[PDB]
């Protein structure tokens, strides 16, 4: 009668360690894996303990549909404080005048953030233009084939990508300007998932204005860098700025949408000023358009992250991020590796392994087997996305642990050694060998000691640094 | 040189309490606010500590785009174990045969989960039919006006709602079957945000098959009940079942999508069997269609919740949820309140305040001022959505704290006293008064003591019960 | 060198009779077929010789893209007179104040005319409501199935039809009003292909305004009647009126689009009167949106037809059209045939053959074999559009030849005899394939011939407009 | 009583007002020099067919698939027409089919899109200012103007402003990005032959359809004066007037039979254009066919298979050269100096003026032609070129020597234009009193020359 009811009350108060050992262990194993591993995936990073604590707060429970002042349900005086605070810090972090800029912090993640904007400004079967996927774009910028639309962006809207110049490795802004005149985009996307150089926002803006389109920036990857002022801000030229709250920003998984406010343009003769209406449209698209109940526990984490983002320690961190990157870049350069575009203005670099006579697809799996985390990526000029020639390497992940130039140079050597091992297996399994067979020879018995020998040395090195979290 | 670099390392390992007192205090205030208040919002509930500890895990860091064995990035052997485990438990919680059913657990929340399905199955400007918003539907089921499409569902797809019978209060399935033949839906939604009775899924399935459409169930609200077997399962008749992982399920904020697998139909003559292709379509729609990197930390929280959901304590909980609702319902009934449809087969009820001579819009604000959390809602027969007559009251939130029949009856009294105070203020401020003026008189000095008197008594009563997941 | 160049000049000036005997013969055969046949298809009629002469004019050559004074090419002073005249007459025919009403006369036909309006006013994937197809609607009013969108209207625009009350036979305006509040139509269509009663335009207007939609009337089938004032005008309540120039109007194949002009409403507070903008939108949609170079030769025929439509002879014609319809109706009623809705306010009627124990699909083919031209059509309450129960019978065609009440009663008898032959064939034998076969059979051929010859010999007694 | 007379009364009596307008136009066409490429004079045989009782018969559907009965004679007609259509272009009935119901050329194209591309699908065509046609797609930074652009996705390909030739290289490049479903090989104002083989290669590479719009060259291709697009294209749309000298109507030719085969399984995949395209015309877009037009078309198709027509089409091309070089030698700059077809595009910047002004002056002199933007024009509001075609006049009996005398009459108009020039104000000065005698003096001399030739029709 009341024996089991007490057990119920005990259940909701019971610690994870006891309640779910099965899941508890998986988290422990992952925590370990992250610790002994070298993280070089550009989109990776380690959240602060302060942010993680906010995610476990009672803020999960409160359903606060709508916005501060326009709430559907009542009893939100504290959620209002939080959401209002978060967006106040968001504007501060990027030095934005509240009268010139507004921000929406409800987006569940980065992808939903972008889609909300399209839905709001472009509208069904509208025209969008973004960096091609194999050229360093992101799916949310549109992606389709001769057979079908794959990305949601491509499905409901009409996309046609602009490309990078295969020779220089830089974005071909000239061709974009030309195609834009024939396609008449409604919105142009200024952002990249795998691009190692600063975007010419001023140039793009002009191209957008020429065609009467919006300029949306997706600073997902460089959000941390722009905040610290380590890289040129896109806010000066863009109309809308979408961003993820994780990656270089080191927040929890969430998204944000910055939009212009105030005067859009004026009539020379009548003096009648036309004001921006992005605030209304964008907000309406997030709710009640797409999303429902805001994830207040995440908004908190974001708010916490934004405070840390405005500290000097962060500013230093972001500079060290870039500094490390050049160290890693030149270290590999001097080793004979062809960096795409000959260096990086930001945190990441794209290594074209054709320089060593191999591809990223095979190098990826080998590096992984050695606790070296990174991802393959197609290089400018690749005639096949199935066999990518390059590897994407970012520094923000390791930098957060305390890695410095000298260390990233030691990492560079570990990476090379992985490529080496790759070239051995590649030559051993023949030339007409498939990726299927390569994976088998790798996990094979012949190279089992070699892989382990490196892995153990990589792990022992990573173990020397702290792992933010706990 | 190295003085500030050490401070950097200290910052990432620094506790929230020290790192951000400003946010830390807001959380404490909220945590205190939830404690002393009676939560009666149907969609509300309290997550278990175990779940809350999973969200703060290092799982936040790993980017695992794709699905188990189909991952874009490497080093996911532990994320795979987690995602594979979660979805295995998901199928178990609802006693589903893995050969007959599959599930995607990546959706960031409920809404994204629904939109994912439409994208995959219905496709741009396809026809969708759902319960009307003011009749207890949800925005994601579609909503528009004579002037614009408001819901993303309506914006990108061609939607037309089906309505509840204003007299009885039950969904008018007959009109639906009729309009369906005209509209030719490609998919019909069997779900509600504010409905107090069990859906006739069998009926709906027939109507769907007649027009060659899919039947998608949105068990967001009754997900918990269905799991414990307290309410008839929609899995028997529907093709797809979307759900939120919170509310009655008591998980963290996230969504799931269940889809049919195996044989769809067979040719009587040729014997050639056609198989379902929902798995591929739905999965492709979630990724790389709509979402990006899975929120693994939430996927863990869902997994944890799903294990608790399969326990006997949960089963008892859910039974107590419904039991409490009947107690609250009949308690208000006996006080003369008109419950829409005269009761409820589930956790929530819809109280029509026209019975006491007022509206939900005003009662909402008064009850709130007294720490009585609930939301207004239009009743069947309301000629104006600006002045809703009804209140939505749910029991899952309080029942989680430990409330029982007898307690919910006491709550029923406290609520009544709230309606009373509402009636006094309503008559005091006149009849032609606006909601604007009402709010002012409420917060006014004349009723400042009355409100406080009730508030303090409610909070003192609310304090007697525990609150899940603290320090 | 110049021997064949002379032949070329001879070719262009050579008569059809000589230039293309093959085609010349087909025309003669058809002309004959029409002469000896009894035309009872509601959408049919016979154009005046005057109109037919206009179609062969040199107006075929001029390319006059755009509108009067807004032409893309020059040298259109005479085309401008024509088009301007035509639309001037169009407004007169329906007693429409030019300040309150405008009209576009370029549409190649009725369907394009309708689509032109949707593209202009409704816009891609915009809601549209019309009478359901099997209930007497038209394809252009929207039509779809579970499998697919079939009509262009349905493919590009959201369409959801309203239905006729299966019991009474009248349109169910109540259900429309109800579904309208859910669907939120941008444009409602008040027109019918197979409907025997006057539309409650006032009622429909109220429903349209309630949902802030446009009321578009498709008077294709009643354009002639409304012109003569035999039937209540849709112009008093509608925002836009589309119409074909043939059928009851006895013009050549073409379409027109009438639209409201002037003040739409006057805002209460501001007081700034808001004006209609249909003229621009609709015109823009016809060109340069949808169509290209106008078919001035048809625009002439239309103009000619419109002048004839304003004569007393025409007025008497249309009255006689309705008169004949009543006679035909009651003549079949008295023979026991069930007329859907029990009569007709206009030119056509729907005969429910279930009263005789058969279907339209089986009666159509028999009647055809007897030179009796008519078409099958689903009755209200038909559970299968594959086996339609009714026949659609119209008077405008024969009436033009000179047929009168007494004659249409003799026609009624001829029709009944066709139904008998149908029933007798139906009794012996089954799928339609088997039926058609039995009809072409060895024993009913005579009975049929006995009828055909008698029908033809009767039709042969009346003049055939054209030549 | 009197009503029976009315339906049998002649137009001359029934409607004098309309009757006169027709006479005035017939006169105007007789005394004017028609040089609009899209113009032509239909034979008297075709015109008589348009007035036939065929106007009355509603024959919805296709032969053997009709909705209404009593169509045995319409079936013969429509079947004959499409039989002749295939003969005219030497097309094997097993390899090719044709739909002859389209009310005009524009509807013909749209039908194809509706059938193959499917709503919000991607098509590509020559840019409008580069000599494309509206139906091939046309939009701006502000709105979609052409029906094609509205319901579908269009992204045009351009002509090389330097050479004047279509830039196939850039098309091949952009195509890889836009993923067209259908590419359009057709022009309204393009002076050279299309590289269909090339286009086909580009289409196959992207897995698209190759639709040819031979509206302007339909007559030329029929006679074999110009390379046929049927050898490389999947679908061929066309108008039945213009160079074909039929009444206003359209046709749609489509491939039939085997599309491709599987090397291993030997399983052959067959084309399905016939069904889709037909279904799109009806019951998709159109309603009751215009049988009176279908007859005229059939008549024209017979004339198109005669030797007299063949000669005509060659004289058409021949005249064009004579006119091209006659203006070349007078110092005028022809874009792509030389034409492989009936029309040419005269760039008036070589004479220090624009087409927009020359058009209005030439018109005032009974010289019919139209302005058109040249490759390299930075403003479509001030077009630099004039489009001049020979099929119209050639049909009257005009020969090389005559078109040279025409070339002189045209030049004199350009002079008169340059005098007035040294657009609103220009029009006023033209109609002004100062140049009233000069215009009349040339007009009377132009008209007196045209009067010397016969006018097909009556
Ligand atoms: C709550 C709910 C959802 C999901 O809402 P989110 O706040 O986006 O998780 C979906 N459907 C229904 C019927 C609901 O009640
Ligand atoms: C990572 C990323 C996003 C957001 O990804 P989520 O996993 O959905 O948070 C958005 N845009 C770009 C360019 C990105 O690289
Ligand atoms: C006949 C008809 C049309 C037009 O038909 P066409 O054969 O295309 O001229 C349009 N609407 C209605 C209601 C009709 O009956
Ligand atoms: C003229 C033309 C058409 C058809 O024009 P209509 O005015 O509709 O007869 C079609 N395509 C092209 C390329 C043309 O030049
Ligand atoms: Cl990424
Ligand atoms: Cl809700
Ligand atoms: Cl009809
Ligand atoms: Cl043209």
What is the C-alpha R_g of chain C? 24
Give C313's contacts in chain D (Cβ within 8 Å).
2-3, 6
Give D380's contacts in chain A (Cβ within 8 Å).
none
Residue from B275, B443, B272 nearest B369 by CA: B443
Q: Is A129 helix (H, G, I), strand (E, B) or coil?
A: strand
Yes or no: say if D70 and C368 are a contact pair by the CB < 8 Å rule.
yes
Q: CB-based burial of residue B301 (10 Å sphere; 0-12 exposed, 13-18 middle, 19+ buried)?
A: buried
What is the torsion angle, in degrees rounded to the nearest 10, for the CA atoms of residue B128, residue B131, residue B136 and residue B137? -10
| Nearest residue by C-alpha to atom 5 in ligand 3 | C110
Atom of ligand 4 nearest to the CA of C293: 7
- Residues followed by a break in chain A (C to N exceeding 2.5 Å) are none
- Ligand 2 contact, A223 CB (< 6 A): no
Rounded distance between C-alpha atoms, residue D295 and residue C28, angstroms: 12
User: Which element (helix H / strand E) includes A165?
Assistant: none
The angle subtended at Cα C38 by Cα C36 and Cα C39, nearest 5°, is 120
The gap from C-alpha A278 to its chain's centroid, in whole angstroms, comes to: 24
Catalytic residues of B: 194, 246
Q: Length of chain C, please? A: 467
Ligand 1, CB within 6 Å, residue ranges: A 291-293; B 43, 109-111, 114, 138, 140, 191, 193, 218, 220-221, 244
Taking the centre of ligand 4 as the mean of its atom positions, its distance from the CA of residue B42, in whole angstroms, is: 63
Facing residue for A160 by CB, picked from D120, D127, D155: D155
In order of A466, B75, B196, D166, D185, the CA distances from B6 in angstroms are 11, 30, 58, 66, 69
Q: CB-based burial of residue B92 (10 Å sphere; 0-12 exposed, 13-18 middle, 19+ buried)?
A: middle
In order of B40, B188, B348, B382, B418, the CA distances from B403 in angstroms are 12, 37, 15, 33, 20
Rounded distance between C-alpha atoms, residue D17 and residue C304, angstroms: 9
Residue from D255, D290, D260, D226 nearest D60 by CA: D290
Of A129, A147, A183, A212, which to mutate for an interface test with D (greatest number of D Cβ within 10 Å)?
A183
CB atoms within 10 A of CB C384: 10
Contact call for B56 and A59, based on CB within 8 A: no
Work out whether the CA dihedral B166, B168, B169, B170 comes out positive or negative. negative
- The CATH number of whichever domain residue C81 belongs to comes to 3.40.640.10
- Ligand 2 contact, B293 CB (< 6 A): yes
Contact call for D179 and A211, based on CB within 8 A: no
Give B132's contacts in chain C (Cβ within 8 Å).
182
Rounded distance between C-alpha atoms, residue A30 and residue A469, angstroms: 12
Facing residue for D303 by CB, picked from C19, C109, C402: C19
- C38-39 and C372-373: which strand pairing? parallel
Work out whether the CA dihedral D416, D418, D423, D425 comes out positive or negative. negative
Taking the centre of ligand 1 as the mean of its atom positions, its distance from the CA of residue B111, in whole angstroms, is: 6
Ligand 3, CB within 6 Å, residue ranges: C 43, 109-111, 114, 138, 140, 191, 193, 218, 220-221, 244; D 287-288
Query: Cβ of C2 under 8 Å from any chain D Cβ?
Result: no
D101 backbone φψ class: left, alpha, beta (φ>0; ψ -120 to 50): alpha
Instruction: Give A373-378's long-range contacts (Cβ < 8 A, gap of 24+).
Output: A373/A37, A373/A38, A373/A39, A373/A40, A373/A41, A373/A44, A373/A397, A373/B73, A373/B74, A373/B75, A374/A40, A374/A41, A375/A41, A375/B72, A375/B73, A375/B74, A377/A136, A377/A194, A377/A350, A378/A134, A378/A135
Q: Length of chain D, please? A: 458
Best mutation site among B220, B251, B253 for ligand 1 pocket (most ligand atoms within 8 Å of CB): B220
In order of A411, D243, D297, D394, D457, the CA distances from D246 in angstroms are 79, 8, 6, 15, 12
User: Which element (helix H / strand E) includes C199?
Assistant: none
Yes or no: say if A373 and A38 are a contact pair by the CB < 8 Å rule.
yes
CB atoms within 10 A of CB C86: 26
Residue from A95, A155, A151, A97 nearest A125 by CA: A155
Rounded distance between C-alpha atoms, residue B228 and residue B323, angstroms: 14
Rounded distance between C-alpha atoms, residue C316 and residue C312, angstroms: 6
Work out whether the CA dihedral D96, D100, D104, D108 comes out positive or negative. negative
D189 included as an active-site residue: yes
Facing residue for B63 by CB, picked from A23, A44, A470: A44
Neighbours of chain D (3+ CB pairs under 8 A): A, C
Task: Answer whether the bond into residue B288 is a cis peptide, omega within 30°.
Answer: yes
The gap from C-alpha A214 to its chain's centroid, in whole angstroms, comes to: 22
Yes or no: say if A352 and A338 are a contact pair by the CB < 8 Å rule.
yes
Facing residue for B155 by CB, picked from A124, A400, A469: A124
| Nearest residue by C-alpha to atom 5 in ligand 1 | B110
What are the two backbone dihedrals, phi and then psi, of residue C66, each rounded to the nearest 5 degrees?
A: 95, -155
- Ligand 2 contact, A218 CB (< 6 A): yes
Q: CB-based burial of residue D379 (10 Å sphere; 0-12 exposed, 13-18 middle, 19+ buried)?
A: exposed
User: Which element (helix H / strand E) includes D368?
Assistant: strand D367-368
Contact call for D48 and C112, based on CB within 8 A: no
Q: CB-based burial of residue C246 (10 Å sphere; 0-12 exposed, 13-18 middle, 19+ buried)?
A: buried
In order of B36, B61, B303, D290, the CA distances from B281 in angstroms are 46, 28, 24, 46
Contact call for A163 and D155, based on CB within 8 A: no
- Give the contacts of C312 (CB within 8 A, at least 6 positions apart): none
Q: Which string of DSSP letters, residue by residue, matches D117-141?
A: I-SS-EEE-B-GGGT--GGG--B-S
Pull the structure tokens for residue B337.
């309140």
The gap from C-alpha A81 to its chain's centroid, in whole angstroms, comes to: 28
A374 included as an active-site residue: no
Q: Which string of DSSP letters, residue by residue, matches B425-452?
A: HHHHT-SS--HHHHHHHHHSSTTHHHHH
What is the C-alpha R_g of chain A? 24
Rounded distance between C-alpha atoms, residue B254 and residue B249, angstroms: 11
Q: Which residue has the tokens 């930001």?
A: A346
- Give the contacts of B268 (CB within 8 A, at least 6 positions apart): none
Q: Is B320 helix (H, G, I), strand (E, B) or coil?
A: helix
Give first-to-last CA distance, chain A, whole Å.
40
Report the gap between the CA of B191 and the closest CA in chain C (Å).
18
What are the two backbone dihedrals, phi and then psi, of residue C58, each rounded to the nearest 5 degrees?
A: -70, -5
Residue pairs between chains A and B whose CB atoms are closer than 8 Å = 329
Query: Cβ of A383 under 8 Å from any chain D Cβ?
Result: no
CB atoms within 10 A of CB A335: 14
What is the C-alpha R_g of chain D? 23
Contact call for A184 and D139, based on CB within 8 A: yes
Contact call for A179 and D179, based on CB within 8 A: no
Residue from B419, D370, B424 nearest C75 by CA: D370
Atom of ligand 3 nearest to the CA of C255: 9
Q: Length of chain A, please? A: 470
Work out whether the CA dihedral A411, A417, A423, A424 comes out positive or negative. negative
Query: Cβ of D4 under 8 Å from any chain C Cβ?
Result: yes
Taking the centre of ligand 6 as the mean of its atom positions, its distance from the CA of residue C102, in whole angstroms, is: 51
The 3-state secondary structure of B45-96 reads: CCCCHHHHHHHCCHHHCCCCCCCCCCCCCCCCHHHHHHHHHHHHHHHHHCCC
Residue from A261, A258, A248 nearest A192 by CA: A248
- D370-372 and D385-389: which strand pairing? antiparallel
Residue from C348, C343, C352, C324 nearest C410 by CA: C324
- Give the contacts of C25 (CB within 8 A, at least 6 positions apart): none
- Give the contacts of B119 (CB within 8 A, at least 6 positions apart): A152, A155, B285, B289, B290
CB atoms within 10 A of CB A105: 26
Task: Answer whether the bond into residue B443 is a cis peptide, omega within 30°.
Answer: no
Residue from D399, D74, D89 nearest D240 by CA: D89
Facing residue for D179 by CB, picked from A125, A144, A211: A144
Q: CB-based burial of residue B195 (10 Å sphere; 0-12 exposed, 13-18 middle, 19+ buried)?
A: buried
What is the torsion angle, in degrees rounded to the nearest 10, for the CA atoms of residue C400, residue C404, residue C408 and residue C409? 180
Q: Is A376 helix (H, G, I), strand (E, B) or coil?
A: strand
Give the chain B residue nearest A48 (alpha carbons).
Answer: B12
Yes or no: say if D439 and D417 are a contact pair by the CB < 8 Å rule.
no
Contact call for C112 and D114, based on CB within 8 A: no
| Nearest residue by C-alpha to atom 3 in ligand 3 | C110
In order of A109, A140, A148, A153, A190, the CA distances from A143 in angstroms are 19, 8, 9, 7, 15
The gap from C-alpha B95 to its chain's centroid, in whole angstroms, comes to: 21
Yes or no: say if C467 and C49 are a contact pair by the CB < 8 Å rule.
yes
User: Which element (helix H / strand E) includes A13?
Assistant: helix A3-13
Residue from A219, A212, A222 nearest A241 by CA: A219
Facing residue for D206 by CB, picked from A146, A183, A212: A146
Rounded distance between C-alpha atoms, residue D148 and residue D109, angstroms: 9
DSSP structural state of residue D280: I
In order of C165, C171, C206, C289, the CA distances from C174 in angstroms are 10, 9, 12, 36
Give first-to-last CA distance, chain C, whole Å.
40
Contact call for A160 and D141, based on CB within 8 A: no
The 3-state secondary structure of D180-238 reads: CCEEEEECCCCCCCCCHHHHHHHHHHHCCEEEEECHHHHHHHHHCCCCCHHHCCCEEEE
Rounded distance between C-alpha atoms, residue B407 and residue B399, angstroms: 10
Strand C187-191: give its sheet, edge to edge: C101-104, C255-260, C240-244, C214-218, C187-191, C128-129
What is the torsion angle, in degrees rounded to the nearest 10, for the CA atoms of residue A350, residue A353, residue A358 and residue A362? -30
Query: Cβ of C117 under 8 Å from any chain D Cβ?
Result: no
Structure-determination approach: X-ray
Rounded distance between C-alpha atoms, residue B15 and residue B217, angstroms: 43
Q: Which string of DSSP letters, residue by residue, matches C1-60?
A: --HHHHHHHHHHHS-HHHHTHHHHHHHHHHHHHHHHSEE--TT-----HHHHHHHTSGGG
- Give the contacts of B21 (CB within 8 A, at least 6 positions apart): none
What are the two backbone dihedrals, phi and then psi, of residue A76, each rounded to the nearest 5 degrees?
A: -120, 20
- Ligand 2 contact, A191 CB (< 6 A): yes
Task: Answer whether the bond into residue D283 is a cis peptide, omega within 30°.
Answer: yes
D224 backbone φψ class: left, alpha, beta (φ>0; ψ -120 to 50): left
Rounded distance between C-alpha atoms, residue B119 and residue A143, angstroms: 15
Rounded distance between C-alpha atoms, residue A136 and residue D158, angstroms: 29
Rounded distance between C-alpha atoms, residue C367 and residue C392, angstroms: 12
| Ligand approaching nearest to the C-alpha of C244 | 3
Yes or no: say if C41 and C374 are a contact pair by the CB < 8 Å rule.
yes
Give the chain A residue nearest D120 (alpha carbons).
Answer: A125
**Beta-carbon-side half-sphere exposure of residue C219 (alpha carbons within 13 Å):** 28
In order of A35, B286, C76, C363, C377, the CA distances from C103 in angstroms are 78, 51, 19, 41, 32
Neighbours of chain C (3+ CB pairs under 8 A): B, D
Rounded distance between C-alpha atoms, residue A251 and residue A246, angstroms: 4
Pull the structure tokens for residue A19.
């309640």
Contact call for D56 and C47, based on CB within 8 A: yes
Rounded distance between C-alpha atoms, residue C51 and residue B89, angstroms: 79
Interaxial angle between packed helices B21-36 and A77-93, expressed in degrees from 0 to 180 and rounded to the nearest 10: 160
- D33-34 and B214-218: which strand pairing? unpaired
CB atoms within 10 A of CB C280: 12
Q: How many helices and strands (H and E) does chain C possess?
A: 18, 14
In order of C216, C379, D84, D220, D380, the CA distances from D305 in angstroms are 47, 49, 9, 12, 40
The B residues from 37 to 96 touching A (CB cutoff 8 Å) are 37, 41, 43-63, 72-75, 77-79, 81-82, 85
Domain that holds residue C179: 58-310
Rounded distance between C-alpha atoms, residue B144 and residue C185, angstroms: 12
The angle subtended at Cα A258 by Cα A252 and Cα A259, nearest 5°, is 165
- Give the contacts of A115 (CB within 8 A, at least 6 positions apart): A140, A152, A153, A290, B290
In order of A299, B298, B338, B445, the CA distances from B417 in angstroms are 36, 40, 16, 19
- B158-159 and B127-129: which strand pairing? parallel
Give first-to-last CA distance, chain D, whole Å.
32
Contact call for B146 and C183, based on CB within 8 A: no
Query: Which stretches of C41-185 are DSSP H helices?
Result: 49-55, 77-93, 110-117, 152-156, 173-183
């Amino acid at each position: 009668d009341a024996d089991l009811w007490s057990s119920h009350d005990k259940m909701l108060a019971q610690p994870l360690k006891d309640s779910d050992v099965e899941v508890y262990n998986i988290i422990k194993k992952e925590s370990n894996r992250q610790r002994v591993g070298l993280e070089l995936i550009a989109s990776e990073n380690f959240a602060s303990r302060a942010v993680l604590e906010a995610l476990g707060s009672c803020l999960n429970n409160k359903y606060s549909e709508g916005y501060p002042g326009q709430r559907y349900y009542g009893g939100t005086e504290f959620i209002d404080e939080l959401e209002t605070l978060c967006q106040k810090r968001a504007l501060q972090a990027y030095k934005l005048d509240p009268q010139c800029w507004g921000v929406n912090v409800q987006p569940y993640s980065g992808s939903p953030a972008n889609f909300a904007v399209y839905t709001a400004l472009v509208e069904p079967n509208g025209a969008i233009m973004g960096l091609d996927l194999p050229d360093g774009g992101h799916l949310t910028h549109g992606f389709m084939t001769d057979k079908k639309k794959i990305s949601a962006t491509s499905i409901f809207f009409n996309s046609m990508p602009y490309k990078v110049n295969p020779d220089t490795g830089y974005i071909n802004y000239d061709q974009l300007e030309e195609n834009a005149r024939l396609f008449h985009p409604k919105l142009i996307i200024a952002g990249t998932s795998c691009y190692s150089r600063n975007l010419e926002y001023a140039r793009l803006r002009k191209i957008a204005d020429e065609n009467g389109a919006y300029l949306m920036a997706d600073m997902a990857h460089i959000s941390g860098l722009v905040a610290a002022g380590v890289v040129p801000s896109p806010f000066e030229h863009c109309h809308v700025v979408t961003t993820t709250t994780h990656k270089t920003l080191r927040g929890c998984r969430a998204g944000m949408i910055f939009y212009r406010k105030g005067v859009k343009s004026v009539d020379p003769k009548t003096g009648k000023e036309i004001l921006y209406n992005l605030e209304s449209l964008i907000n309406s698209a997030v709710f009640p358009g797409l999303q429902g109940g805001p994830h207040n526990h995440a908004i908190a984490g974001v708010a916490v992250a934004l405070k840390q983002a405005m500290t000097l320690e962060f500013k230093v961190y972001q500079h060290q991020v870039v500094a490390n990157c050049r160290a890693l870049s030149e270290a590999l350069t001097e080793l004979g590796y062809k960096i795409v575009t000959g260096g990086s203005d930001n945190h990441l670099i794209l290594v074209d392994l054709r320089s060593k006579g191999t591809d990223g697809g095979r190098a990826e799996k080998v590096l992984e087997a050695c606790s070296i985390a990174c991802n393959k990526n197609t290089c400018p000029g690749d005639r096949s996305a199935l066999r990518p020639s390059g590897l994407r390497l970012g520094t923000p992940a390791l930098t957060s642990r305390g890695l410095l130039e000298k260390d990233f140079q030691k990492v560079a050597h570990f990476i090379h050694r992985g490529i080496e091992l790759t070239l051995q297996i590649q030559s051993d399994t023949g030339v007409r060998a498939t990726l299927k067979e390569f994976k088998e020879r790798l996990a094979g018995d012949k190279y089992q000691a070699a892989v382990q020998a490196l892995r153990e040395e990589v792990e022992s090195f990573a173990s020397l640094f702290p792992l933010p979290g706990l």
